[PDB]
């Protein structure tokens, strides 16, 4: 039932998914002054050179760029992590207006969008098993601001008209997710959850400090997507973000400053 509206948006999710009110929900506001610098946090190791993009899909909430996760080809490690985590997909959350769209906030600042690169811990063998574990996933979150175009994003932007509506897919090979990363890998980290139902508390969040820049034209193409399926009334895919949730008993750690 769930989605992003008055009637079925984030404030309703708890009725189907009670953990929505749990102890380690995401996203959160990142209070930069109160984040704890941890000298012992390692640099993040992002090894995406063998990544094998396969397909891009409109799942009716967002669009997902999928990877072959049947071998260690695109992996995240280091940082605050203790194992190796394989990239399964990325997606974005974005707004109706440039002034909103991110899930995490930084000193209450909203960004225009937020990229989630989703990885699962190889010690659990597959994504479905990993989501049942408290250290099953590592999600790398990257903020988007509007300004100069991100040229590594354009291949995603240009395919979107082929996946306008829920359930559409398109071959999407040879997409290189290194083109979506900012210069710095400095990050904040905390234990949290998936930000969409089922809201499972299985995620080590790693949120990069440095946003990427995308153009107004790029984010405008995200907003032409539709949450409905073909042959239904148009509902633009905008404002597909969950607001910040209570931090409760958590400390956000910083790799820097």
242 belongs to the binding site for Zn ion (CB under 5 A): no
Residue 59 binding partner per list ligand 5EF, Zn ion, none, with a CB distance cut-off of 5 to 8 Å that depends on partner kind: ligand 5EF
| Residue 61 designated active-site | yes
Determine whether the annotation assigns residue 93 to a binding site: yes
**What token pair was written down for 170?**
């398109």
Distances, alpha carbon 129 to alpha carbons 73, 87, 133, 138, in Å? 19, 15, 7, 14
Of residues 64, 100, 121, 204, which one binds ligand 5EF by CB under 6 A? 64
Phi, psi angles (nearest 5°) of residue 49: -60, -25
127 belongs to the binding site for ligand 5EF (CB under 6 A): yes
Minimum gap (Å) between residue 115 Cβ and Zn ion? 8
Question: Using alpha carbons only, what angle is made at residue 127 by residues 124 and 133, rounded to the nearest 5 degrees?
Answer: 55
237 belongs to the binding site for ligand 5EF (CB under 6 A): no
SS3 state of residue 141:
strand
Closer to ligand 5EF by Cβ: residue 35 or 139? 139
> What is the C-alpha to C-alpha distance for residues 188 and 252, in angstroms, rounded to an integer?
7
> What is the C-alpha to C-alpha distance for residues 53 and 35, in angstroms, rounded to an integer?
34
**What token pair was written down for 70?**
């049947």
Closer to Zn ion by Cβ: residue 207 or 254? 207
139 belongs to the binding site for ligand 5EF (CB under 6 A): yes
Q: Active-site residue among 14, 61, 104, 119?
A: 61
CA 251 and chain centroid, separation:
20
Of residues 195, 218, 226, 245, which one binds ligand 5EF by CB under 6 A? 195
Distances, alpha carbon 247 to alpha carbons 29, 48, 139, 165, 252, in Å? 8, 31, 17, 35, 9
> What is the C-alpha to C-alpha distance for residues 207 and 43, in angstroms, rounded to an integer?
13
Residue 89 binding partner per list Zn ion, ligand 5EF, none, with a CB distance cut-off of 5 to 8 Å that depends on partner kind: ligand 5EF
Instruction: Please say whether the beta carbons of 121 and 83 come within 8 A.
Output: yes
87 belongs to the binding site for ligand 5EF (CB under 6 A): no
Of residues 24, 110, 116, 150, which one binds Zn ion by CB under 5 A? 116
**What token pair was written down for 62?**
């967002």
Closer to Zn ion by Cβ: residue 124 or 205? 205
Name the residues that contact ligand 5EF, by CB under 6 A. Answer: 59, 64, 88-89, 116, 118, 127, 131, 139, 194-196, 198
Name the residues that contact Zn ion, by CB under 5 A. Answer: 116
Please identify every residue annotated as catalytic. Answer: 61
**What residues are designated binding site?**
91, 93, 116, 195-196
């Amino acid at each position: 039932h769930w989605g992003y509206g008055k009637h079925n948006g984030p404030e309703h999710w708890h009725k189907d998914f009670p953990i929505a009110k749990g102890e380690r929900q995401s996203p959160v506001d990142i209070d930069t002054h109160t984040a704890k610098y941890d000298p012992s946090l390692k640099p993040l190791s992002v090894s995406y050179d063998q990544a094998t993009s396969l397909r891009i899909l409109n799942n009716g909430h967002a669009f997902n760029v999928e990877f072959d996760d049947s071998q260690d080809k695109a992996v995240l490690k280091g940082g605050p992590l203790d194992g190796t985590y394989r990239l399964i997909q990325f997606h974005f959350h974005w707004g109706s207006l440039d002034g909103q769209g991110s899930e995490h906030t930084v000193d209450k600042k909203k960004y225009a969008a937020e990229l989630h690169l989703v990885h699962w811990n190889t010690k659990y063998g597959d994504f479905g098993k990993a989501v049942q574990q408290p250290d099953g996933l590592a999600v790398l979150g990257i903020f988007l601001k509007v300004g100069s175009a991100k040229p590594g994003l354009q291949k995603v932007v240009d395919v979107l008209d082929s996946i306008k509506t829920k359930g559409k897919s398109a071959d999407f090979t040879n997409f290189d997710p290194r083109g979506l990363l900012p210069e710095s890998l400095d990050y904040w980290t905390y234990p949290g959850s998936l930000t969409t139902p089922p809201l499972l508390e299985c995620v080590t969040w790693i949120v990069l400090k440095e946003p990427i820049s995308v153009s107004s034209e790029q984010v405008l193409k995200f907003r032409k997507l539709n949450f409905n399926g073909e042959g239904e009334p148009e509902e633009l895919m905008v404002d597909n973000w969950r607001p910040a949730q209570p931090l409760k008993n958590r400390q956000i750690k910083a790799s820097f400053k």
